[PDB]
Structures are given as C-alpha cells and as structure tokens.
Ligand SMILES: C=CC(C)(C)OC[C@H]1O[C@H](O[C@@H]2C3=C([C@H](C)COC(C)=O)C[C@H](O)[C@]3(C)/C=C3/[C@@H](COC)CC[C@H]3[C@@H](C)[C@H]2O)[C@H](O)[C@@H](O)[C@@H]1O
Ligand SMILES: C=CC(C)(C)OC[C@H]1O[C@H](O[C@@H]2C3=C([C@H](C)COC(C)=O)C[C@H](O)[C@]3(C)/C=C3/[C@@H](COC)CC[C@H]3[C@@H](C)[C@H]2O)[C@H](O)[C@@H](O)[C@@H]1O
Ligand SMILES: [Mg+2]
C-alpha cells in the first residue's frame with residue numbers, strides 16, 4: 001500500500 | 010530458537 | 019469483571035474478530051470474560067483462549083529477554099537503575115498475566131474438565147504458565163514454581179498416555195512443551211531428548227490410522243519435535 | 252501524570268529501551284512523560300516521540316481497517332451488533348491516542364518551537380494525527396477535521412519551502428504524507444501526484460550538495476515518493 005513516514009514496525 | 014506450541018503471531 | 023455485562027456468545031464472536039484484527043490483548047480479555055460465565059469451553063473456545071494468552075505473554079517474554087540481556091551486559095566488567103526498573107516493570111506485568119491464566123484454570127476450568135481432551139489441554143496450559151513464571155523467577159519460591167509446572171505437565175502426560183492416541187495433537191504439543199521444560203527449566207537435556215524422540219517415534223507408528231486431514235495436523239507438531247531434536251543433538 | 256515522578260533523562264532512556272523491546276505503548280507513555288516535563292525536545296527526542304506514537308496508532312488503524320471491512324461485508328445484500336460495537340471500541344481508542352498526541356502538540360510543543368526543523372516536524376505530526384482522525388470520521392465535524400489536517404500540513408509546507416533545502420528529510424516526509432492526504436482524504440489525486448512529482452524532482456536536483464550520509468537519508472524518502480507515484484499512475 002502507499003507509503004507514509006514514520007512507518008510502523 | 011526451540012519450538013513450543015501454541016506459538017505467537 | 020468488565021465483561022460481566024456482555025453475552026457469552028458475543029464475547030466469543032468478539033474474540034474471533036480480535037484474532038482477525040491481531041488485537042490479542044482484547045482477544046484475551048474477551049476469552050477471560052467468556053470463561054468467567056462459568057460454563058465449560060468447547061474445543062474451539064479452548065483453542066481461542068490458548069492462542070489469545072500465548073500472544074499476550076509471548077510479547078512480554080520477548081521484551082523481558084531483550085531487557086534482561088541489556089541488564090546482564092550492563093553488569094559486566096568494563097547507567098543507573100533504569101534498565102533494572104524497566105525489566106522489573108515488564109516482569110511484573112508478565113507475572114500478572116500468568117497469574118490471571120492460572121487463576122482461570124484453577125477457578126474453575128480444571129475441576130470441571132472430565133474428558134481427556136479438555137483436562138489434558140488445561141493441565142498443559144497450567145504447566146506452560148508456571149513455566150513462564152519459572153523463566154523469570156529468582157526467589158525462595160523458584161523451586162516450587164518449577165515443581166508446579168512439572169506436576170501439571172506430569173498429570174497431563176499420565177492422562178494423555180492412557181486416554182489419547184500417540185498422534186493426538188494435544189498429546190503431541192504437551193510432549194513438545196514438557197520436553198522444552200526439561201531442557202531449559204529443569205536442566206535435564208537427556209530427559210528432554212528422550213521425551214521428544216519417543217513421542218516422535220510413537221506418533222510415526224500411528225500415522226497409518228489417520229485420515230489425510232488428521233495426518234496433516236499430527237505431522238505438523240511432529241516436525242516441531244524433530245526441529246528441537248535437531249537443535250539439541 | 253503517571254510519569255510525573257520520573258526524571259526526564261530516565262524517561263528518555265526507558266523510551267529507548269522500550270523501542271529495543273518493541274514495547275511501543277510503553278515507549279509512547281515514556282515520551283509523553285518527557286514532553287510533560289515542559290522542556291523543548293531535541294531532534295532525537297522528537298524522532299522517538301513520532302516513532303512511538305506511530306507504532307501505537309498504526310496497530311489501531313490496521314485493526315480498524317480489518318473490522319471496518321468485516322462490517323461493510325456484513326451490511327451487503329445477501330449477525331447482530333457485535334462487529335459494529337467492536338469496530339467502535341477500536342475507533343474510540345484510536346481517537347483517544349490521536350487526541351493525546353494533538354494535546355501534547357498544542358500544550359505546548361508547537362508554540363515553543365521556533366526553529367524550522369522543530370516547527371515543521373510538529374506541524375507535520377499535527378497534520379498526520381488529524382488525518383488519522385479523518386480516516387474514521389463520519390459526523391458533522393468531518394470537514395473540520397479534514398481542514399485541520401490541511402491547515403497544519405500547509406503551514407508546515409510554507410515554512411519548509413522557505414527555511415529548508417529540498418532534500419531535508421523532514422521536508423520530504425512532510426510532502427510524502429501531505430500528498431497521501433490529498434490522494435485519499437481530500438479526493439485530490441491530481442494535487443497528490445503533482446506534489447509528489449515536484450518534491451521528487453526538486454530533491455533530485457539538490458542531491459549534489461550532500462555528503463554520502465545525507466544523500467542516503469534523502470534518497471530513502473525520495474524512493475517512497477517514487478513508489479507512491481508508481482502506484483498512482
Ligand atoms: C526511533 C527513533 C530513533 C532511533 C531515534 O530514530 C529513528 C530515525 O530518526 C531519523 O530519521 C527520521 C525518521 C525516519 C527515517 C526515514 C529513517 O531513515 C533514515 C535512517 O533516515 C523514519 C522515522 O519514522 C523518522 C523518525 C520520522 C520522520 C518523519 C517525522 O515526521 C514528523 C519525517 C521524515 C522522517 C525524518 C524525521 C528522519 O530524519 C534518523 O536520521 C534515522 O537514522 C533513525 O533511524
Ligand atoms: C486461534 C484459534 C483457532 C483459529 C480457533 O484455532 C487455532 C488452531 O486450533 C487447532 O489447532 C490446535 C493448535 C495449533 C495447531 C498446531 C495448528 O495447526 C493445525 C492446523 O493443526 C496451534 C495453536 O496454538 C493450537 C490452538 C494449540 C495447541 C496446543 C494447546 O495447548 C494447550 C496443543 C497443540 C495444539 C492443538 C490444540 C491444535 O489442535 C486447529 O485444529 C487448527 O486448525 C487451528 O489453526
Ligand atoms: Mg446470556
């Protein structure tokens with residue numbers, strides 16, 4: 001899916 | 010690592 | 019309890035939704051509420067209970083191991099109370115979850131469980147959660163915690179050998195976990211290896227009696243026994 | 252707050268331990284306690300705050316999407332209140348975390364942030380957490396929630412264009428997220444694509460000024476912009 005930042009994990 | 014059951018995830 | 023006003027069936031339904039959503043704390047809280055309705059659990063419901071709490075305590079144990087490793091390094095030859103404090107916080111939370119599970123088993127799942135498949139399941143869980151307590155224990159009660167795990171596993175083993183075929187998945191998983199208990203809690207690697215090997219071999223000899231679906235279930239846990247034997251030898 | 256008795260430095264240290272242990276709820280609680288000490292945050296501390304809360308809300312959003320999808324299917328042509336109730340429970344918890352983050356930003360991180368790198372960072376976070384509120388909103392305030400996200404992102408954009416080079420990672424990440432806001436919240440895919448493309452191209456032209464380490468930082472976020480453009484075209 002499309003990216004946003006920060007990301008999780 | 011060594012296995013036990015149930016496992017997580 | 020906070021789940022006392024929710025219908026049993028709704029708690030079970032929500033536990034299944036929580037499992038799909040990977041919300042394991044919620045899943046465990048829903049299953050605790052279902053247990054506290056006072057009725058026996060079905061096989062599927064027992065499985066939900068065990069998966070929910072394993073996921074909760076598994077995250078806590080993994081975090082405890084990370085923090086313990088940092089604490090060990092910080093106490094070697096060559097930064098204040100914070101690492102110990104935070105390891106203790108995680109430890110206390112983990113102990114609380116184990117105490118909760120053990121309390122559900124003692125009030126009153128085990129005493130009402132008469133069929134082998136339910137009694138062995140709950141006694142295995144009792145051994146597992148005393149084992150998790152033993153992983154973090156250091157005080158005057160450590161030996162009693164280890165013996166509580168051993169005693170629960172041993173009763174489950176005795177019933178399983180009398181009442182279940184050697185390929186029964188609960189029997190196999192019990193043996194897998196009791197073998198790990200021997201290896202890394204009781205300092206008995208030879209007993210751990212002997213249990214895993216005899217369990218594997220006896221299950222192999224009984225596979226011919228199974229349908230394709232039962233064969234798949236049993237061989238999956240057998241592969242875990244083999245994986246552990248490969249690691250240990 | 253429950254962290255009021257712990258030293259600021261100890262909260263920061265424990266947030267870093269929690270990050271290593273993958274205990275993101277704890278990490279976020281420690282960082283909230285550090286913010287509430289009332290002192291400005293360093294760059295590293297801002298990063299810890301944003302990672303902690305993103306991991307918390309990310310799990311909630313993922314769970315909300317699973318439950319929403321089940322609820323949608325259960326309302327198609329062709330099982331009681333439980334799915335809606337549990338989706339609402341997760342939704343309310345998510346909204347609570349967003350409100351907490353927005354409250355930290357409003358009391359008083361944004362008003363004390365004078366340097367571009369801190370002000371843009373906090374305004375981006377404000378846009379992000381209003382955006383998460385917008386993902387679940389349906390009432391009379393939905394348009395105002397969307398505009399609150401837009402207004403925060405726009406102020407951050409205006410500062411970032413005046414005060415930061417086009418390769419600055421905060422500027423790039425702001426553009427990435429504001430572009431996603433345009434695409435999937437504001438129903439403005441053309442604006443989303445135009446923002447991602449101009450941001451990517453302007454950063455490409457400024458890479459020559461960077462060291463190897465800064466080059467690596469900037470190109471990582473540029474690749475996310477390119478990934479989104481590839482998905483959208
Ligand atoms: C957990 C926190 C610790 C370990 C302290 O730091 C995490 C990372 O913080 C820095 O990265 C930031 C950063 C990330 C980078 C893209 C990671 O890729 C590197 C190495 O660039 C992802 C994280 O979500 C974070 C903190 C968040 C943001 C967004 C914040 O929107 C309010 C805007 C873009 C980006 C910027 C701020 C990056 O500058 C370092 O430079 C990294 O080295 C380090 O991994
Ligand atoms: C989340 C729960 C739901 C979806 C209801 O069920 C999970 C699984 O429950 C059953 O598996 C059990 C089972 C697992 C199997 C090894 C999964 O491999 C299959 C398909 O055999 C892993 C789980 O930890 C669980 C519930 C736990 C145990 C241990 C419990 O110790 C107290 C003993 C061994 C094993 C037994 C009980 C398996 O019989 C089904 O047969 C599976 O099909 C299904 O995936
Ligand atoms: Mg009823």
Ligand SMILES: [Mg+2]
Pocket residue numbers: 106109110
């Ligand atoms: Mg202790």
Ligand SMILES: [Mg+2]
Pocket residue numbers: 208
């Ligand atoms: Mg020997």
Ligand SMILES: [Mg+2]
Pocket residue numbers: 258259
């Ligand atoms: Mg002080």
Ligand SMILES: [Mg+2]
Pocket residue numbers: 339342343
């Ligand atoms: Mg709602």
Ligand SMILES: [Mg+2]
Pocket residue numbers: 441
């Ligand atoms: Mg067009």
